[PDB]
């Protein structure tokens, strides 16, 4: 090709080799600290992690010598584009220093936030575990209200003036990088250009999120109405049969998930949940057995075994940081770090983390920067569908953790789907509405004097949730969630959720599965493993739209598979709700 393209290819070839060596060495230090926490290693790992962050800055400068307009090879364009990003470099040194100070202060205000007893001002509670325990386990309306209000008053108010200047500085940075605003900048993770038939604009994400949410509304309104009727028995006299759910009664500090409402809403409380923890301890299962069974599951669909380095290097038990994590260091080195316990949860989590490893192994041959998920939602969606198959009674029988004669009754099935929906479906309105608020704020569509007014109009309208006390514009309730005060995009939790049921339905059709989608186990299906692997090996070398089509046969996000997964619960909920109101009036509030 042309001289500029040839020189770009040569540059990228040298970048990819230099990056592999330094990333392997840098992430090798991360493995030392996270498996052997010492005072030396915190700064020793910083010495390796700072060396890595500066290398990308120098390589970014070198990448700018090759105009993107001259590159015709799309794989080279994709790599140059990721390298040519300026980010906060477009800001003046004063504005970068200010933004970084604001960012660090918001993060610190959140992580040190605490509320104290008004009668005993030295007795204080942190979010974890103190306030979180109240929000999950308290049945005292006023104690829940006190924790919900105090967090937003002590923490959120502190963040309000910081969040205003964060919006200004972030928008200026995004505009200088030729985006419309900071929200438009975040939506760039889904952008696809220059591939005919697979393009995707940044605005299209807003329309696709809003269209798929439209179809979610009937299921969510019926879940909401069922929960609301059950919550009236849990908190008598405090909940209107036609109104929104008071925001402090939802089982965590924000209502991000309804998971902790289960024992207050369980359809058939006498049917216990399927748990194979005891069956595993009885059969003398250890951590080695868990991951070996996980490896057998992936081998069963045509994916490879784990590597010799995996077993040699992975830390599968507490001897460290105990977050379940999958490691992709390069040079054929893959590891899992997990302080495994002999429980059903860790058996499911091990399938999740090895799904990450299978994804990592499949795209290991891609260029350095293309060794990533097709977009921000892909990787966790791949891990989630591994737990879906591994948790079914069907699969638990085949590995001998359920008796061969075990039949799951229809009341136990409804309990499981409802518990699933409280977490999976309950978070979708929350996630879309929060990100919609931020998107509109970044767009300049919500004036500062209406920030909290619009936040709670949108909570009432979209989420069916109402503030138990009025909040003026001294509050910054969004910033009282970690993701907002710590500058993380949120829509990934929406797209990942829809992706995972798109994946599972396609894999289960390929396996020619019979019956309800939620009972499917893709084990021993090489067709499903080949369908999945045709996307896994792409990394992000292809448009995410193409990678999705490789699994499910369509180019776009689709919520119909999620609706299919929950169809048995939807049918049951409509019958439960036949004498209840479905939906809500935004006019009721606990205080007015």
């Amino acid at each position: 090709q042309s001289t500029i393209e040839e020189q770009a290819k040569t540059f990228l070839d040298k970048f990819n080799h230099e990056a592999e060596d330094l990333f392997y060495q840098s992430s090798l230090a991360s493995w030392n600290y996270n498996t052997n926490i010492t005072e030396e290693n915190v700064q020793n790992m910083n010495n390796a992690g700072d060396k890595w962050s500066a290398f990308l800055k120098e390589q970014s400068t070198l990448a700018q010598m090759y105009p993107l307009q001259e590159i015709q090879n799309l794989t080279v364009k994709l790599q140059l584009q990721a390298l040519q990003q300026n980010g906060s470099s477009v800001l003046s040194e004063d504005k970068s220093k200010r933004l970084n100070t604001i960012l660090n202060t918001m993060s610190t205000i959140y992580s040190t936030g605490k509320v104290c007893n008004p009668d005993n001002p030295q007795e204080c509670l942190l979010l974890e575990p103190g306030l979180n325990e109240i929000m999950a386990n308290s049945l005292d309306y006023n104690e829940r209200l006190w924790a919900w209000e105090s967090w937003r008053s002590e923490v959120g108010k502190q963040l309000r003036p910081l969040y205003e200047e964060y919006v200004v500085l972030k928008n200026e940075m995004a505009r200088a990088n030729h985006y419309e605003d900071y929200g438009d900048y975040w939506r760039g993770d889904y952008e696809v250009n220059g591939v005919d038939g697979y393009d995707y604009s940044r605005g299209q994400l807003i329309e696709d999120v809003e269209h798929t949410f439209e179809e979610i509304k009937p299921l969510y309104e019926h879940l909401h109405a069922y929960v609301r009727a059950k919550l009236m028995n849990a908190y008598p006299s405090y909940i209107s049969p036609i109104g929104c759910l008071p925001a402090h009664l939802l089982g965590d500090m924000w209502g991000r998930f309804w998971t902790n409402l289960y024992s207050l809403t369980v359809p058939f409380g006498q049917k216990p949940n399927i748990d194979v923890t005891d069956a595993m301890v009885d059969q003398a299962w250890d951590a080695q057995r868990i991951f070996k069974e996980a490896e057998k599951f992936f081998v069963s669909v045509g994916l490879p075994n784990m590597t010799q380095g995996f077993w040699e290097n992975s830390m599968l038990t507490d001897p460290a940081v105990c977050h379940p994590t999958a490691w992709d260091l390069g040079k054929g080195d893959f590891r899992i770090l997990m302080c495994t316990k002999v429980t059903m949860d860790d058996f499911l989590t091990a399938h999740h983390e090895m799904g990450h490893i299978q994804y990592d192994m499949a795209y290991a041959a891609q260029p350095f920067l293309l060794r990533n998920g097709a977009n921000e939602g892909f990787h966790e969606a791949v891990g989630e569908i591994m737990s879906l198959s591994a948790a079914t009674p069907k699969h638990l029988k085949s590995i001998g953790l359920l008796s061969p004669d075990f039949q799951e009754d229809n009341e136990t099935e409804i309990n499981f789907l409802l518990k699933q929906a409280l977490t999976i479906v309950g978070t979708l309105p929350f996630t879309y509405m929060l990100e919609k608020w931020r998107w509109m704020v970044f767009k300049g569509e919500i004036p500062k004097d209406q920030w909290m007014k619009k936040w709670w109009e949108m909570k009432r309208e979209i989420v069916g949730v109402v503030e138990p006390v009025p909040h003026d514009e001294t509050y910054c309730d969004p910033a009282s969630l970690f993701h907002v005060s710590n500058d993380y995009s949120f829509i990934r939790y929406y797209t990942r959720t829809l992706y995972q049921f798109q994946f599972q339905e396609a894999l289960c059709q390929a396996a020619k599965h019979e019956g309800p989608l939620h009972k499917c186990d893709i084990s021993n299906s090489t067709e499903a493993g080949q369908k999945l692997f045709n996307m896994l090996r792409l990394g992000k070398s292809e448009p995410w739209t193409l990678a999705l089509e490789n699994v499910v046969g369509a180019k776009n996000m689709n919520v119909r598979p999620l609706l299919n997964y929950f169809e048995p619960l939807f049918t049951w909920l409509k019958d439960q709700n036949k004498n209840s109101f479905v939906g809500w009036s935004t006019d009721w509030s606990p205080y007015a």
């Binding site: 992430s27 915190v42 790992m45 910083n46 992690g49 990308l56 970014s60 992709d328």
Partner: peptide, 12 residues
């Protein structure tokens, strides 16, 4: 933590 990303390659 270190990542194959240019936006957030490093977290301590």
């Amino acid at each position: 933590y270190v990542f194959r990303s240019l936006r957030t390659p490093f977290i301590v």
